[PDB]
Amino acid sequence: AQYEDGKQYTTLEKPVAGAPQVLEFFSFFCPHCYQFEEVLHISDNVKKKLPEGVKMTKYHVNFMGGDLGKDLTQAWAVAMALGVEDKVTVPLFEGVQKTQTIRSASDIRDVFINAGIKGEEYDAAWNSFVVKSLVAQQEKAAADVQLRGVPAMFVNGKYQLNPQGMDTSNMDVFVQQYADTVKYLSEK
Ligand SMILES: Cn1nccc1CN
């Protein structure tokens, strides 16, 4: 077959019911996640190939980067709560991995301030139970799949993308294979 269980994707032995349609996990400490975001634009290219009926979710993980990694999961909850993901993703990746200027929770906050989020608004969100609930949702979704690595993408709590077998000589072809695989899996 063109798409084969075990090749372009794997099938979870323990399927997760009630899972998001398309669920991505990442860490701002994760080098391939940096590539997925600013080099490949995986999420946008996946979105462009799905109908308006399939929704996309993207969650941060705790298991990379120690204390700061956990701070970044809470900051990502702030980004989701305020709807400013598109404003802070590139600066957070650059701050962690390129300039290495993000070393503390205050340095994370600075990225939001520079992106135009008011300080009192960031602080209110950071300390809010709405954000605490989003942190809990991110942790529970990762735990449901016993997640041990990023980047990772899951379709309908049933299928996990397997990019390792794909040709990476051309980046545009790789991204297209990835998105077409997500589309195929979403249609199963
Ligand atoms: C710098 N910082 N971090 C959290 C709260 C404050 C002061 N507004």
mmCIF file of N, CA and C in Angstrom, residues 8-104:
data_model
loop_
_atom_site.group_PDB
_atom_site.id
_atom_site.type_symbol
_atom_site.label_atom_id
_atom_site.label_comp_id
_atom_site.label_asym_id
_atom_site.label_seq_id
_atom_site.Cartn_x
_atom_site.Cartn_y
_atom_site.Cartn_z
ATOM 1 N N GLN A 8 4.755 5.354 7.324
ATOM 2 C CA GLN A 8 4.522 6.789 7.455
ATOM 3 C C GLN A 8 3.815 7.156 8.751
ATOM 4 N N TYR A 9 3.265 6.178 9.463
ATOM 5 C CA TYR A 9 2.561 6.415 10.713
ATOM 6 C C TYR A 9 2.576 5.120 11.509
ATOM 7 N N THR A 10 2.285 5.236 12.799
ATOM 8 C CA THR A 10 2.058 4.051 13.606
ATOM 9 C C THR A 10 0.685 4.155 14.247
ATOM 10 N N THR A 11 0.157 3.013 14.660
ATOM 11 C CA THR A 11 -1.163 2.943 15.268
ATOM 12 C C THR A 11 -0.987 2.648 16.748
ATOM 13 N N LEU A 12 -1.586 3.487 17.583
ATOM 14 C CA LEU A 12 -1.417 3.348 19.020
ATOM 15 C C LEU A 12 -2.017 2.029 19.474
ATOM 16 N N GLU A 13 -1.246 1.263 20.256
ATOM 17 C CA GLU A 13 -1.773 0.016 20.802
ATOM 18 C C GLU A 13 -2.943 0.292 21.735
ATOM 19 N N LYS A 14 -2.895 1.410 22.459
ATOM 20 C CA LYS A 14 -3.953 1.820 23.380
ATOM 21 C C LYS A 14 -4.554 3.117 22.852
ATOM 22 N N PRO A 15 -5.560 3.039 21.978
ATOM 23 C CA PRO A 15 -6.146 4.263 21.411
ATOM 24 C C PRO A 15 -6.739 5.149 22.494
ATOM 25 N N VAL A 16 -6.672 6.456 22.258
ATOM 26 C CA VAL A 16 -7.177 7.466 23.181
ATOM 27 C C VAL A 16 -8.480 8.020 22.619
ATOM 28 N N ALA A 17 -9.576 7.801 23.338
ATOM 29 C CA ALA A 17 -10.888 8.290 22.935
ATOM 30 C C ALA A 17 -11.099 9.731 23.389
ATOM 31 N N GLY A 18 -11.878 10.474 22.604
ATOM 32 C CA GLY A 18 -12.138 11.865 22.918
ATOM 33 C C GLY A 18 -10.951 12.776 22.735
ATOM 34 N N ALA A 19 -9.951 12.335 21.985
ATOM 35 C CA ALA A 19 -8.751 13.115 21.748
ATOM 36 C C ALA A 19 -9.003 14.177 20.678
ATOM 37 N N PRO A 20 -8.194 15.239 20.651
ATOM 38 C CA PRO A 20 -8.331 16.236 19.579
ATOM 39 C C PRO A 20 -8.092 15.615 18.205
ATOM 40 N N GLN A 21 -8.734 16.207 17.185
ATOM 41 C CA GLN A 21 -8.637 15.696 15.815
ATOM 42 C C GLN A 21 -7.187 15.626 15.336
ATOM 43 N N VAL A 22 -6.464 16.738 15.433
ATOM 44 C CA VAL A 22 -5.058 16.828 15.057
ATOM 45 C C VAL A 22 -4.352 17.489 16.225
ATOM 46 N N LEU A 23 -3.437 16.756 16.853
ATOM 47 C CA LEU A 23 -2.812 17.166 18.109
ATOM 48 C C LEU A 23 -1.307 17.122 17.944
ATOM 49 N N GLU A 24 -0.658 18.277 18.064
ATOM 50 C CA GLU A 24 0.789 18.377 17.933
ATOM 51 C C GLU A 24 1.372 18.665 19.307
ATOM 52 N N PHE A 25 2.529 18.069 19.594
ATOM 53 C CA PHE A 25 3.297 18.372 20.803
ATOM 54 C C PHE A 25 4.668 18.889 20.412
ATOM 55 N N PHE A 26 5.176 19.855 21.188
ATOM 56 C CA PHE A 26 6.488 20.410 20.916
ATOM 57 C C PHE A 26 7.111 20.901 22.218
ATOM 58 N N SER A 27 8.380 21.293 22.116
ATOM 59 C CA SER A 27 9.046 22.023 23.194
ATOM 60 C C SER A 27 9.890 23.127 22.578
ATOM 61 N N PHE A 28 9.946 24.277 23.259
ATOM 62 C CA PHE A 28 10.831 25.329 22.756
ATOM 63 C C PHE A 28 12.304 24.962 22.917
ATOM 64 N N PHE A 29 12.622 23.886 23.659
ATOM 65 C CA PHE A 29 13.980 23.341 23.744
ATOM 66 C C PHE A 29 14.318 22.340 22.639
ATOM 67 N N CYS A 30 13.360 21.983 21.813
ATOM 68 C CA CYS A 30 13.495 20.855 20.907
ATOM 69 C C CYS A 30 14.026 21.326 19.549
ATOM 70 N N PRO A 31 15.211 20.878 19.116
ATOM 71 C CA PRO A 31 15.765 21.419 17.864
ATOM 72 C C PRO A 31 14.916 21.097 16.640
ATOM 73 N N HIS A 32 14.381 19.881 16.521
ATOM 74 C CA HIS A 32 13.538 19.605 15.360
ATOM 75 C C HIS A 32 12.235 20.390 15.405
ATOM 76 N N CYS A 33 11.736 20.710 16.608
ATOM 77 C CA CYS A 33 10.550 21.554 16.725
ATOM 78 C C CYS A 33 10.811 22.948 16.186
ATOM 79 N N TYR A 34 12.005 23.488 16.451
ATOM 80 C CA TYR A 34 12.402 24.762 15.850
ATOM 81 C C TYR A 34 12.315 24.692 14.335
ATOM 82 N N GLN A 35 12.850 23.614 13.760
ATOM 83 C CA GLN A 35 12.799 23.431 12.307
ATOM 84 C C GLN A 35 11.356 23.305 11.825
ATOM 85 N N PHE A 36 10.539 22.517 12.541
ATOM 86 C CA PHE A 36 9.136 22.349 12.163
ATOM 87 C C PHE A 36 8.399 23.679 12.111
ATOM 88 N N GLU A 37 8.745 24.603 13.002
ATOM 89 C CA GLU A 37 8.032 25.872 13.060
ATOM 90 C C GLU A 37 8.543 26.854 12.008
ATOM 91 N N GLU A 38 9.804 27.289 12.102
ATOM 92 C CA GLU A 38 10.219 28.404 11.256
ATOM 93 C C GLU A 38 10.794 27.995 9.898
ATOM 94 N N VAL A 39 11.284 26.771 9.750
ATOM 95 C CA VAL A 39 11.843 26.332 8.474
ATOM 96 C C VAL A 39 10.788 25.656 7.601
ATOM 97 N N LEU A 40 10.069 24.686 8.170
ATOM 98 C CA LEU A 40 9.105 23.853 7.446
ATOM 99 C C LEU A 40 7.657 24.345 7.511
ATOM 100 N N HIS A 41 7.279 25.103 8.533
ATOM 101 C CA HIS A 41 5.891 25.538 8.712
ATOM 102 C C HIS A 41 4.923 24.353 8.611
ATOM 103 N N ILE A 42 5.230 23.306 9.376
ATOM 104 C CA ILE A 42 4.437 22.074 9.340
ATOM 105 C C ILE A 42 2.972 22.356 9.665
ATOM 106 N N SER A 43 2.708 23.088 10.755
ATOM 107 C CA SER A 43 1.326 23.269 11.191
ATOM 108 C C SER A 43 0.495 23.979 10.134
ATOM 109 N N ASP A 44 1.023 25.073 9.571
ATOM 110 C CA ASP A 44 0.292 25.810 8.548
ATOM 111 C C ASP A 44 0.062 24.957 7.305
ATOM 112 N N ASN A 45 1.056 24.153 6.915
ATOM 113 C CA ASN A 45 0.873 23.354 5.714
ATOM 114 C C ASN A 45 -0.098 22.207 5.951
ATOM 115 N N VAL A 46 -0.106 21.646 7.164
ATOM 116 C CA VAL A 46 -1.125 20.659 7.510
ATOM 117 C C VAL A 46 -2.509 21.303 7.471
ATOM 118 N N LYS A 47 -2.641 22.490 8.090
ATOM 119 C CA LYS A 47 -3.927 23.186 8.133
ATOM 120 C C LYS A 47 -4.463 23.465 6.738
ATOM 121 N N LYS A 48 -3.591 23.895 5.828
ATOM 122 C CA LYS A 48 -4.034 24.231 4.485
ATOM 123 C C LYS A 48 -4.549 23.011 3.722
ATOM 124 N N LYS A 49 -4.205 21.786 4.147
ATOM 125 C CA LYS A 49 -4.632 20.600 3.419
ATOM 126 C C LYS A 49 -5.841 19.919 4.048
ATOM 127 N N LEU A 50 -6.276 20.355 5.221
ATOM 128 C CA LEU A 50 -7.445 19.819 5.908
ATOM 129 C C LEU A 50 -8.671 20.689 5.654
ATOM 130 N N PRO A 51 -9.876 20.133 5.756
ATOM 131 C CA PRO A 51 -11.084 20.969 5.670
ATOM 132 C C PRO A 51 -11.195 21.909 6.866
ATOM 133 N N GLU A 52 -12.135 22.857 6.768
ATOM 134 C CA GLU A 52 -12.427 23.699 7.925
ATOM 135 C C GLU A 52 -13.106 22.920 9.051
ATOM 136 N N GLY A 53 -13.496 21.656 8.811
ATOM 137 C CA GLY A 53 -14.108 20.836 9.847
ATOM 138 C C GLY A 53 -13.141 20.178 10.817
ATOM 139 N N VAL A 54 -11.889 19.972 10.420
ATOM 140 C CA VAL A 54 -10.893 19.361 11.296
ATOM 141 C C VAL A 54 -10.136 20.477 12.014
ATOM 142 N N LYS A 55 -10.131 20.439 13.356
ATOM 143 C CA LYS A 55 -9.477 21.429 14.207
ATOM 144 C C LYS A 55 -8.085 20.960 14.601
ATOM 145 N N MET A 56 -7.193 21.924 14.813
ATOM 146 C CA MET A 56 -5.809 21.652 15.181
ATOM 147 C C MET A 56 -5.507 22.188 16.569
ATOM 148 N N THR A 57 -4.817 21.373 17.362
ATOM 149 C CA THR A 57 -4.382 21.733 18.706
ATOM 150 C C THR A 57 -2.878 21.565 18.792
ATOM 151 N N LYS A 58 -2.202 22.471 19.497
ATOM 152 C CA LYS A 58 -0.757 22.381 19.670
ATOM 153 C C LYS A 58 -0.432 22.644 21.128
ATOM 154 N N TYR A 59 0.240 21.680 21.763
ATOM 155 C CA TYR A 59 0.574 21.728 23.182
ATOM 156 C C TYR A 59 2.084 21.620 23.425
ATOM 157 N N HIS A 60 2.553 22.301 24.474
ATOM 158 C CA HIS A 60 3.943 22.251 24.925
ATOM 159 C C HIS A 60 4.123 21.116 25.938
ATOM 160 N N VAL A 61 5.377 20.668 26.116
ATOM 161 C CA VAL A 61 5.662 19.561 27.028
ATOM 162 C C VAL A 61 6.655 19.974 28.102
ATOM 163 N N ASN A 62 6.630 19.212 29.210
ATOM 164 C CA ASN A 62 7.481 19.522 30.354
ATOM 165 C C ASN A 62 8.840 18.841 30.298
ATOM 166 N N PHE A 63 8.996 17.734 29.560
ATOM 167 C CA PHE A 63 10.130 16.850 29.836
ATOM 168 C C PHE A 63 11.451 17.313 29.237
ATOM 169 N N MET A 64 11.508 18.485 28.601
ATOM 170 C CA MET A 64 12.769 19.035 28.112
ATOM 171 C C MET A 64 13.039 20.353 28.857
ATOM 172 N N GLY A 65 14.277 20.559 29.309
ATOM 173 C CA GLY A 65 14.629 21.866 29.851
ATOM 174 C C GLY A 65 14.315 22.106 31.309
ATOM 175 N N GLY A 66 13.972 21.066 32.069
ATOM 176 C CA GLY A 66 13.914 21.241 33.507
ATOM 177 C C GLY A 66 12.921 22.286 33.945
ATOM 178 N N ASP A 67 13.375 23.138 34.866
ATOM 179 C CA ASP A 67 12.484 24.134 35.443
ATOM 180 C C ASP A 67 11.961 25.096 34.376
ATOM 181 N N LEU A 68 12.835 25.546 33.476
ATOM 182 C CA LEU A 68 12.401 26.475 32.440
ATOM 183 C C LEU A 68 11.435 25.809 31.477
ATOM 184 N N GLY A 69 11.626 24.515 31.232
ATOM 185 C CA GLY A 69 10.696 23.788 30.387
ATOM 186 C C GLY A 69 9.280 23.840 30.928
ATOM 187 N N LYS A 70 9.129 23.644 32.238
ATOM 188 C CA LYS A 70 7.823 23.764 32.878
ATOM 189 C C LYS A 70 7.292 25.197 32.821
ATOM 190 N N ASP A 71 8.166 26.195 33.004
ATOM 191 C CA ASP A 71 7.733 27.583 32.835
ATOM 192 C C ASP A 71 7.214 27.830 31.417
ATOM 193 N N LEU A 72 7.843 27.203 30.415
ATOM 194 C CA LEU A 72 7.407 27.419 29.041
ATOM 195 C C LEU A 72 6.056 26.765 28.770
ATOM 196 N N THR A 73 5.757 25.652 29.446
ATOM 197 C CA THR A 73 4.426 25.073 29.299
ATOM 198 C C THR A 73 3.358 26.019 29.846
ATOM 199 N N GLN A 74 3.640 26.666 30.985
ATOM 200 C CA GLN A 74 2.706 27.662 31.520
ATOM 201 C C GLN A 74 2.638 28.901 30.627
ATOM 202 N N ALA A 75 3.771 29.329 30.066
ATOM 203 C CA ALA A 75 3.735 30.463 29.138
ATOM 204 C C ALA A 75 2.941 30.127 27.880
ATOM 205 N N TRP A 76 3.040 28.881 27.407
ATOM 206 C CA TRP A 76 2.258 28.490 26.245
ATOM 207 C C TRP A 76 0.767 28.500 26.559
ATOM 208 N N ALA A 77 0.396 28.106 27.783
ATOM 209 C CA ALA A 77 -0.984 28.236 28.229
ATOM 210 C C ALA A 77 -1.425 29.699 28.192
ATOM 211 N N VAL A 78 -0.553 30.624 28.629
ATOM 212 C CA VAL A 78 -0.875 32.050 28.505
ATOM 213 C C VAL A 78 -1.080 32.412 27.037
ATOM 214 N N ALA A 79 -0.177 31.950 26.158
ATOM 215 C CA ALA A 79 -0.324 32.247 24.731
ATOM 216 C C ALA A 79 -1.645 31.744 24.170
ATOM 217 N N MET A 80 -2.047 30.512 24.520
ATOM 218 C CA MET A 80 -3.358 30.032 24.081
ATOM 219 C C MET A 80 -4.504 30.838 24.678
ATOM 220 N N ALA A 81 -4.429 31.149 25.968
ATOM 221 C CA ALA A 81 -5.531 31.872 26.598
ATOM 222 C C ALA A 81 -5.741 33.248 25.962
ATOM 223 N N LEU A 82 -4.646 33.939 25.637
ATOM 224 C CA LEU A 82 -4.716 35.269 25.039
ATOM 225 C C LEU A 82 -4.817 35.265 23.516
ATOM 226 N N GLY A 83 -4.642 34.110 22.874
ATOM 227 C CA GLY A 83 -4.642 33.994 21.428
ATOM 228 C C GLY A 83 -3.486 34.677 20.731
ATOM 229 N N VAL A 84 -2.301 34.640 21.330
ATOM 230 C CA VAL A 84 -1.141 35.327 20.781
ATOM 231 C C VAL A 84 -0.049 34.341 20.367
ATOM 232 N N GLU A 85 -0.428 33.082 20.088
ATOM 233 C CA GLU A 85 0.542 32.077 19.647
ATOM 234 C C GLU A 85 1.383 32.576 18.483
ATOM 235 N N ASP A 86 0.736 33.171 17.469
ATOM 236 C CA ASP A 86 1.448 33.613 16.273
ATOM 237 C C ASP A 86 2.403 34.762 16.568
ATOM 238 N N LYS A 87 2.220 35.459 17.680
ATOM 239 C CA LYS A 87 3.106 36.566 17.999
ATOM 240 C C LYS A 87 4.330 36.153 18.805
ATOM 241 N N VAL A 88 4.260 35.055 19.555
ATOM 242 C CA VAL A 88 5.342 34.714 20.473
ATOM 243 C C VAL A 88 6.097 33.449 20.101
ATOM 244 N N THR A 89 5.613 32.640 19.149
ATOM 245 C CA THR A 89 6.284 31.363 18.893
ATOM 246 C C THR A 89 7.712 31.562 18.389
ATOM 247 N N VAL A 90 7.893 32.352 17.333
ATOM 248 C CA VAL A 90 9.245 32.570 16.812
ATOM 249 C C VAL A 90 10.149 33.233 17.846
ATOM 250 N N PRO A 91 9.743 34.309 18.528
ATOM 251 C CA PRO A 91 10.640 34.872 19.552
ATOM 252 C C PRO A 91 10.960 33.927 20.694
ATOM 253 N N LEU A 92 10.049 33.029 21.079
ATOM 254 C CA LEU A 92 10.374 32.086 22.148
ATOM 255 C C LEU A 92 11.392 31.054 21.656
ATOM 256 N N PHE A 93 11.208 30.518 20.443
ATOM 257 C CA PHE A 93 12.212 29.623 19.868
ATOM 258 C C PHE A 93 13.574 30.310 19.763
ATOM 259 N N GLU A 94 13.596 31.542 19.245
ATOM 260 C CA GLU A 94 14.870 32.239 19.086
ATOM 261 C C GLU A 94 15.506 32.497 20.441
ATOM 262 N N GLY A 95 14.700 32.920 21.420
ATOM 263 C CA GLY A 95 15.251 33.223 22.735
ATOM 264 C C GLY A 95 15.846 32.010 23.428
ATOM 265 N N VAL A 96 15.213 30.838 23.278
ATOM 266 C CA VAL A 96 15.749 29.628 23.900
ATOM 267 C C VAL A 96 16.970 29.102 23.143
ATOM 268 N N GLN A 97 16.878 28.981 21.808
ATOM 269 C CA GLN A 97 17.844 28.217 21.022
ATOM 270 C C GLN A 97 18.816 29.039 20.187
ATOM 271 N N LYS A 98 18.447 30.247 19.757
ATOM 272 C CA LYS A 98 19.325 31.021 18.889
ATOM 273 C C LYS A 98 20.158 32.019 19.678
ATOM 274 N N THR A 99 19.507 32.945 20.380
ATOM 275 C CA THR A 99 20.246 33.897 21.192
ATOM 276 C C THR A 99 20.534 33.391 22.593
ATOM 277 N N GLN A 100 19.812 32.368 23.057
ATOM 278 C CA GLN A 100 19.982 31.836 24.412
ATOM 279 C C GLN A 100 19.871 32.949 25.455
ATOM 280 N N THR A 101 18.946 33.878 25.212
ATOM 281 C CA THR A 101 18.641 34.955 26.148
ATOM 282 C C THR A 101 17.507 34.617 27.104
ATOM 283 N N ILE A 102 16.819 33.492 26.918
ATOM 284 C CA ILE A 102 15.719 33.106 27.792
ATOM 285 C C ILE A 102 16.280 32.100 28.787
ATOM 286 N N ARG A 103 16.464 32.562 30.020
ATOM 287 C CA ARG A 103 17.011 31.753 31.093
ATOM 288 C C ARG A 103 16.125 31.702 32.324
ATOM 289 N N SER A 104 15.034 32.468 32.371
ATOM 290 C CA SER A 104 14.187 32.584 33.555
ATOM 291 C C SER A 104 12.760 32.893 33.133
#
